[PDB]
Coordinates of all heavy atoms in Angstrom, one line a residue:
Chain B
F54 N 7.9 16.6 -24.9 CA 9.0 16.3 -24.0 C 9.7 17.6 -23.4 O 10.3 17.6 -22.4 CB 10.1 15.5 -24.7 CG 9.6 14.1 -25.0 CD1 9.9 13.5 -26.2 CD2 8.9 13.4 -24.1 CE1 9.5 12.2 -26.4 CE2 8.4 12.1 -24.3 CZ 8.8 11.5 -25.5
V57 N 7.1 19.1 -20.5 CA 7.3 18.5 -19.1 C 8.5 19.0 -18.5 O 8.6 19.2 -17.3 CB 7.3 17.0 -19.2 CG1 8.5 16.5 -20.1 CG2 7.3 16.4 -17.8
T58 N 9.5 19.3 -19.3 CA 10.8 19.9 -18.8 C 10.6 21.3 -18.2 O 11.2 21.6 -17.2 CB 11.9 19.9 -19.9 OG1 12.0 18.6 -20.5 CG2 13.2 20.3 -19.3
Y61 N 8.8 20.9 -15.1 CA 9.8 20.4 -14.1 C 10.7 21.5 -13.6 O 10.9 21.6 -12.3 CB 10.6 19.3 -14.7 CG 10.2 17.9 -14.3 CD1 9.1 17.3 -14.8 CD2 10.9 17.2 -13.3 CE1 8.7 16.0 -14.5 CE2 10.5 15.9 -13.0 CZ 9.4 15.3 -13.5 OH 9.0 14.1 -13.2
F62 N 11.2 22.4 -14.5 CA 12.1 23.4 -14.1 C 11.6 24.8 -14.5 O 12.1 25.4 -15.5 CB 13.5 23.1 -14.7 CG 13.9 21.7 -14.6 CD1 14.4 21.0 -15.7 CD2 13.9 21.1 -13.4 CE1 14.8 19.7 -15.6 CE2 14.3 19.7 -13.3 CZ 14.8 19.1 -14.4
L76 N 18.3 17.1 -23.0 CA 18.7 15.9 -22.3 C 17.6 15.0 -21.9 O 17.7 13.8 -22.2 CB 19.4 16.4 -21.0 CG 19.9 15.2 -20.1 CD1 20.9 14.4 -20.8 CD2 20.6 15.8 -18.8
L77 N 16.5 15.6 -21.4 CA 15.3 14.8 -21.0 C 14.7 14.1 -22.2 O 14.1 13.0 -22.2 CB 14.3 15.6 -20.2 CG 14.8 16.1 -18.9 CD1 13.7 16.8 -18.1 CD2 15.4 14.9 -18.1
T78 N 14.7 14.9 -23.4 CA 14.1 14.4 -24.6 C 14.8 13.1 -25.1 O 14.2 12.1 -25.5 CB 14.1 15.5 -25.7 OG1 13.3 16.6 -25.3 CG2 13.5 14.9 -27.0
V79 N 16.2 13.2 -25.2 CA 16.9 12.1 -25.7 C 16.9 10.9 -24.7 O 16.9 9.7 -25.2 CB 18.4 12.5 -26.0 CG1 19.2 12.8 -24.8 CG2 19.1 11.4 -26.8
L80 N 16.8 11.2 -23.5 CA 16.6 10.1 -22.5 C 15.3 9.5 -22.6 O 15.1 8.3 -22.4 CB 16.9 10.7 -21.0 CG 18.3 11.1 -20.7 CD1 18.4 11.5 -19.2 CD2 19.3 10.0 -21.0
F81 N 14.3 10.3 -22.9 CA 12.9 9.8 -23.1 C 12.9 8.8 -24.3 O 12.3 7.8 -24.3 CB 11.9 10.9 -23.4 CG 11.1 11.2 -22.2 CD1 11.2 12.4 -21.5 CD2 10.1 10.3 -21.8 CE1 10.4 12.7 -20.4 CE2 9.3 10.6 -20.7 CZ 9.4 11.8 -20.0
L82 N 13.6 9.2 -25.4 CA 13.7 8.4 -26.6 C 14.4 7.1 -26.4 O 14.0 6.1 -26.9 CB 14.3 9.2 -27.7 CG 13.5 10.4 -28.3 CD1 14.4 11.3 -29.2 CD2 12.3 9.9 -29.0
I83 N 15.5 7.2 -25.7 CA 16.3 6.0 -25.4 C 15.5 5.0 -24.5 O 15.5 3.8 -24.7 CB 17.6 6.4 -24.7 CG1 18.5 7.1 -25.7 CG2 18.3 5.1 -24.2 CD1 19.8 7.7 -25.0
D84 N 14.8 5.6 -23.5 CA 14.0 4.8 -22.6 C 12.9 4.0 -23.3 O 12.6 2.9 -22.9 CB 13.3 5.8 -21.6 CG 12.4 5.0 -20.6 OD1 12.9 4.6 -19.5 OD2 11.2 4.9 -20.9
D85 N 12.4 4.5 -24.4 CA 11.4 3.7 -25.2 C 12.1 2.7 -26.1 O 11.6 1.6 -26.3 CB 10.6 4.7 -26.1 CG 9.7 5.6 -25.3 OD1 9.3 5.2 -24.2 OD2 9.4 6.7 -25.8
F147 N 21.3 6.5 -13.4 CA 19.9 6.2 -14.0 C 20.0 5.3 -15.2 O 19.1 4.4 -15.3 CB 19.3 7.6 -14.4 CG 18.3 7.5 -15.5 CD1 17.0 7.0 -15.3 CD2 18.7 7.8 -16.8 CE1 16.1 6.9 -16.4 CE2 17.8 7.8 -17.9 CZ 16.5 7.3 -17.6
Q151 N 18.2 1.3 -15.6 CA 17.2 0.9 -16.6 C 17.3 -0.6 -17.0 O 16.3 -1.2 -17.4 CB 17.3 1.8 -17.8 CG 16.9 3.3 -17.6 CD 17.1 4.1 -18.9 OE1 18.2 4.2 -19.4 NE2 15.9 4.6 -19.4
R169 N 13.3 2.5 -7.6 CA 12.8 3.4 -8.6 C 13.5 4.8 -8.4 O 13.4 5.6 -9.3 CB 11.3 3.6 -8.4 CG 10.5 2.9 -9.5 CD 9.7 3.9 -10.3 NE 10.4 4.2 -11.6 CZ 9.8 4.8 -12.6 NH1 8.5 5.1 -12.5 NH2 10.5 5.0 -13.7
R171 N 16.4 5.4 -8.6 CA 17.5 5.4 -9.6 C 16.8 5.3 -11.0 O 17.3 6.0 -11.9 CB 18.5 4.3 -9.4 CG 19.2 4.3 -8.1 CD 20.2 3.2 -7.9 NE 19.6 1.9 -8.0 CZ 19.0 1.3 -7.0 NH1 19.1 1.8 -5.8 NH2 18.5 0.1 -7.1
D172 N 15.8 4.5 -11.1 CA 15.1 4.3 -12.4 C 14.3 5.5 -12.9 O 14.2 5.8 -14.1 CB 14.2 3.1 -12.4 CG 13.6 2.8 -13.7 OD1 14.2 2.2 -14.6 OD2 12.4 3.1 -13.9
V173 N 13.8 6.3 -11.9 CA 13.1 7.5 -12.2 C 14.0 8.6 -12.3 O 13.7 9.7 -12.8 CB 12.0 7.8 -11.2 CG1 12.6 8.6 -10.0 CG2 10.8 8.5 -11.8
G174 N 15.3 8.4 -11.9 CA 16.4 9.3 -12.1 C 16.2 10.6 -11.2 O 16.2 11.7 -11.7
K175 N 16.0 10.3 -9.9 CA 15.9 11.4 -8.9 C 17.1 12.3 -8.9 O 16.9 13.5 -8.9 CB 15.6 10.8 -7.5 CG 15.5 11.9 -6.4 CD 14.3 12.8 -6.7 CE 14.4 14.1 -5.8 NZ 15.5 15.0 -6.3
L177 N 19.5 12.7 -11.1 CA 19.7 13.4 -12.4 C 18.8 14.5 -12.6 O 19.1 15.6 -13.1 CB 19.6 12.4 -13.6 CG 18.4 12.4 -14.5 CD1 18.6 13.4 -15.7 CD2 18.1 11.0 -15.1
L178 N 17.6 14.4 -12.1 CA 16.6 15.5 -12.1 C 17.0 16.6 -11.1 O 16.7 17.7 -11.3 CB 15.2 14.9 -11.8 CG 14.5 14.1 -12.9 CD1 13.2 13.5 -12.4 CD2 14.4 14.9 -14.2
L181 N 20.1 18.3 -12.7 CA 19.7 19.0 -13.9 C 19.0 20.3 -13.5 O 19.1 21.4 -14.1 CB 18.7 18.2 -14.8 CG 19.0 18.1 -16.3 CD1 17.8 17.7 -17.0 CD2 19.5 19.5 -16.8
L209 N 7.3 11.4 -7.4 CA 7.6 11.4 -8.9 C 7.3 10.0 -9.5 O 6.8 9.9 -10.6 CB 9.0 11.9 -9.2 CG 9.4 13.3 -8.8 CD1 10.8 13.6 -9.0 CD2 8.5 14.3 -9.6
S210 N 7.8 9.0 -8.8 CA 7.7 7.6 -9.3 C 6.3 7.2 -9.4 O 5.8 6.7 -10.5 CB 8.5 6.7 -8.4 OG 9.8 7.1 -8.2
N213 N 3.9 9.0 -11.8 CA 4.2 8.6 -13.2 C 3.6 7.2 -13.4 O 3.1 6.9 -14.5 CB 5.7 8.5 -13.4 CG 6.1 8.1 -14.8 OD1 6.2 8.9 -15.7 ND2 6.3 6.8 -15.0
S217 N 1.0 6.2 -16.5 CA 1.6 5.5 -17.5 C 1.4 4.0 -17.5 O 2.0 3.2 -18.3 CB 3.2 5.8 -17.5 OG 3.7 5.3 -16.3
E221 N 2.5 1.0 -20.3 CA 3.5 0.0 -19.9 C 2.8 -1.4 -19.9 O 3.5 -2.4 -20.0 CB 4.1 0.4 -18.6 CG 4.8 1.7 -18.6 CD 5.3 2.1 -17.2 OE1 5.1 1.4 -16.3 OE2 6.0 3.2 -17.1
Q295 N 8.7 20.1 -9.4 CA 8.9 18.8 -10.1 C 7.7 17.9 -9.8 O 7.1 17.4 -10.8 CB 10.2 18.2 -9.6 CG 11.4 18.9 -9.9 CD 12.7 18.1 -9.6 OE1 12.6 16.9 -9.5 NE2 13.8 18.8 -9.4
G298 N 4.6 19.6 -11.4 CA 4.8 19.7 -12.8 C 4.7 18.3 -13.5 O 4.1 18.2 -14.5
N299 N 5.2 17.3 -12.8 CA 5.2 16.0 -13.3 C 3.7 15.4 -13.3 O 3.4 14.7 -14.3 CB 6.0 15.0 -12.4 CG 6.0 13.6 -12.8 OD1 6.5 13.2 -13.9 ND2 5.3 12.8 -12.1
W302 N 1.7 17.3 -16.3 CA 2.0 16.7 -17.6 C 1.5 15.3 -17.8 O 0.9 15.0 -18.9 CB 3.6 16.7 -17.8 CG 4.0 16.1 -19.1 CD1 4.0 16.7 -20.3 CD2 4.6 14.8 -19.3 NE1 4.5 15.9 -21.3 CE2 4.8 14.7 -20.7 CE3 4.8 13.8 -18.5 CZ2 5.4 13.5 -21.2 CZ3 5.4 12.6 -19.0 CH2 5.6 12.5 -20.4
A303 N 1.7 14.5 -16.8 CA 1.2 13.1 -16.9 C -0.3 13.0 -17.0 O -0.8 12.0 -17.5 CB 1.6 12.3 -15.6
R308 N 1.2 10.9 -24.6 CA 2.1 9.8 -24.4 C 1.4 8.7 -23.5 O 1.7 7.5 -23.7 CB 3.4 10.2 -23.7 CG 4.4 9.1 -23.4 CD 5.6 9.7 -22.8 NE 6.6 8.6 -22.4 CZ 7.5 8.1 -23.2 NH1 7.6 8.5 -24.5 NH2 8.3 7.1 -22.8
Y309 N 0.6 9.1 -22.6 CA -0.1 8.2 -21.7 C -1.5 7.9 -22.0 O -2.1 6.8 -21.7 CB 0.0 8.7 -20.3 CG 1.5 8.9 -19.8 CD1 1.8 9.8 -18.8 CD2 2.5 8.1 -20.3 CE1 3.1 10.0 -18.3 CE2 3.8 8.3 -19.9 CZ 4.1 9.2 -18.9 OH 5.4 9.4 -18.4
Ligands
LIG2 C1 10.8 13.9 -16.5 C2 10.0 12.9 -16.3 C3 8.6 13.0 -16.8 C4 10.4 11.7 -15.5 C5 9.5 10.6 -15.6 C6 9.9 9.5 -16.6 N1 11.1 9.9 -17.4 C7 11.4 8.7 -18.3 C8 12.5 9.1 -19.3 C9 13.7 9.5 -18.5 C10 13.4 10.6 -17.5 C11 14.6 10.9 -16.7 C12 12.2 10.2 -16.6 C13 12.6 9.0 -15.7 C14 11.9 11.4 -15.7

Side-chain angles (χ1 to χ4, degrees):
Chain B
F54 290 141
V57 61
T58 307
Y61 258 75
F62 316 129
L76 180 59
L77 294 187
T78 299
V79 68
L80 289 184
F81 257 110
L82 291 170
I83 294 173
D84 179 88
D85 291 333
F147 150 79
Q151 292 181 296
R169 258 244 97 167
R171 300 182 299 274
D172 181 80
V173 87
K175 176 65 195 69
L177 109 85
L178 289 175
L181 228 199
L209 295 176
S210 306
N213 182 90
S217 62
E221 299 174 358
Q295 296 188 22
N299 178 73
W302 178 78
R308 178 180 176 85
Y309 300 154

